Amino acid sequence: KETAAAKFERQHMDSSTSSSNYCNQMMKSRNLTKDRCKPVNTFVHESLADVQAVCSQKNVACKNGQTNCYQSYSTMSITDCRETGSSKYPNCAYKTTQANKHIIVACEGNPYVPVHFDASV
């Protein structure tokens, strides 16, 4: 039934790609529209190793006040998925926006790996 690290990979990792229909396909294929249309989500187009490496990079405060968040030293290729107004469950519609920004992830466990995508700056 998935571990926290595995869930992060399913919800936020897409190393395969470096379209306008991307989010519609991805949000559905990654099961992010089963219980409802997940409002917003971010996919990272970098290797798993490079993202896991962020856990040893810049320590920053998490949006929730916890101290286990880390910001990438280099910018990363990411895709932001935001639900449109016309989007009505179960036909979830999203706007695909590409960008190159630094990512902030929360890390936990042994091995210390990403378990939550906190923000992109």
UniProtKB/Swiss-Prot annotation:
Catalyzed reactions: an [RNA] containing cytidine + H2O = an [RNA]-3'-cytidine-3'-phosphate + a 5'-hydroxy-ribonucleotide-3'-[RNA]; an [RNA] containing uridine + H2O = an [RNA]-3'-uridine-3'-phosphate + a 5'-hydroxy-ribonucleotide-3'-[RNA]
Chaperone in keyword set: no
Subcellular location: Secreted
Glycosylated position list: K1, K7, N31, K34, K38
Homology family: Belongs to the pancreatic ribonuclease family.
Keywords noted in UniProt: Disulfide bond, Endonuclease, Glycation, Glycoprotein, Hydrolase, Lyase, Nuclease, Secreted, Signal
Record's subunit section: Interacts with and forms tight 1:1 complexes with RNH1. Dimerization of two such complexes may occur. Interaction with RNH1 inhibits this protein. Monomer.
SS bond partners: C23-C81, C37-C92, C55-C107, C62-C69
UniProt source species: Bos taurus
Entry EC no(s): 4.6.1.18
Assigned GO CC terms: extracellular region
Enzyme class: lyase
Tissue spec: Pancreas.
An example Gene Ontology biological process: defense response to Gram-positive bacterium
Active site: H12, H116
Name assigned to this protein: Ribonuclease pancreatic
Binding site for substrate: K7, R10, K38, P39, V40, N41, T42, K63, R82
Function as written in the Swiss-Prot or TrEMBL entry: Endonuclease that catalyzes the cleavage of RNA on the 3' side of pyrimidine nucleotides. Acts on single-stranded and double-stranded RNA.
